[PDB]
Specification:
Phosphorylase Kinase, domain 1, alpha+beta, membrane, 6-stranded antiparallel beta sheet, two-stranded antiparallel ribbon, Transferase(Phosphotransferase), domain 1, binds the ligand c1cc(-c2cnn3cc(-c4ccc(OCCN5CCCCC5)cc4)cnc23)ccn1, 305 residues, transmembrane, 9 helices, activin receptor activity
Length: 305
């Protein structure tokens, strides 16, 4: 009964269903022309995050198999009644979190998700001069988690949601983050302590800590374990549940120095053993001790052998 369309850049669009709840907007599955897309709608009060994500996607070189594909962004409506839209590709399998909740992964499936994920993060982190669109800066994501990794039909991963992302220009100090912070559960101990004056490398190391946790999520659901695979739980859920306070997290991560358990039986398999070692180095309390994104990709290659 739907002959009426919305229009985006003169093209017809129909909203289907709200599929996800962002930190900062709701995400709709929609049809634009003859393809499905995602329309992320932010209220006007979250203009800063919309603007940030738009700016990040506007940087040179921000098209890559392992970065969620940008389509466009626009302010909508009347200056009285405003919404902000950001349109990306749509991925029907959803986030790595959604998938791991419904499925176990084989070793080969895990390796593919991890390799593609680590490739996207490493690209995001890389400063690359000489692109046709300009000079790509290093970009920290600042909210790495399984819910921000989307899977394609073949389980290829891409990094999504750049509302908190921060670029670095090699002749300037790290710009203003406007008081906004990532998901508590995935926060590095230095972030939880309330440390300040973070600069580029500190921000990258914060991403790599969160990445360790995502890599644990995969490990935790992999059938290469020499024993049973438990039901999916978020990092730290076993210890502090689904809805932790900042103080809950400080206690578990900062004061007790605990991490999600890497079970010894997971490490019979040579590869899983290297995976667990890699995870441990990613989430080290010492930020300086943590692997780079490029190093993690090296390890995942080494792992596949
Ligand atoms: C963040 C995310 C996105 C985004 C792009 N695609 N996309 C897809 C989803 C999503 C899609 C499907 C979801 O359903 C749950 C899993 N289903 C269950 C039924 C069988 C298929 C898999 C849940 C979430 C969420 N967000 C996005 C766009 C912009 N910013």
């Amino acid at each position: 009964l739907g002959t009426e369309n919305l229009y985006f850049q003169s093209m017809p669009l129909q909203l289907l269903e709200v599929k996800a709840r962002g930190r900062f907007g709701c995400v709709w599955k929609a049809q634009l022309l003859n393809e499905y897309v995602a329309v992320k709608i932010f209220p006007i009060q979250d203009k800063q995050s919309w603007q940030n994500e738009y700016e990040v996607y506007s940087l040179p070189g921000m098209k890559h198999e392992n970065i969620l594909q940008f389509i466009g962004a626009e302010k909508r409506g009347t200056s009285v009644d405003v919404d902000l839209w950001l349109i990306t590709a749509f991925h029907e399998k959803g986030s790595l979190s959604d998938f791991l909740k419904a499925n176990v992964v084989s070793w080969n499936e895990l390796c593919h998700i991890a390799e593609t994920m680590a490739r996207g993060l490493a690209y995001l982190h890389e400063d690359i001069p000489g692109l046709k669109d300009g000079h790509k800066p290093a970009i920290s994501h600042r909210d790495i988690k399984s819910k921000n990794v989307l899977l394609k039909n073949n389980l290829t991963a891409c990094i999504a949601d750049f509302g908190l992302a921060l670029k670095f220009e090699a002749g300037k100090s790290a710009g203003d983050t406007h008081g906004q912070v990532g998901t508590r559960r995935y926060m590095a101990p230095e972030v939880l302590e309330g440390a300040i004056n973070f600069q580029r490398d500190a921000f990258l190391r914060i991403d790599m800590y969160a990445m360790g946790l995502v890599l644990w999520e995969l490990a935790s659901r992999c059938t290469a374990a020499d024993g049973p695979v438990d039901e999916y739980m978020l990092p730290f859920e076993e210890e502090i549940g689904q809805h932790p306070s900042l103080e809950d997290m400080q206690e578990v991560v900062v004061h007790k120095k605990k991490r999600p358990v890497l079970r010894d039986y997971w490490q019979k398999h040579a590869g899983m053993a290297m995976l667990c070692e890699t995870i441990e180095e990613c989430w080290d309390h010492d930020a300086e001790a943590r692997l780079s994104a490029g190093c993690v990709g090296e390890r995942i290659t080494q792992m596949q052998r």
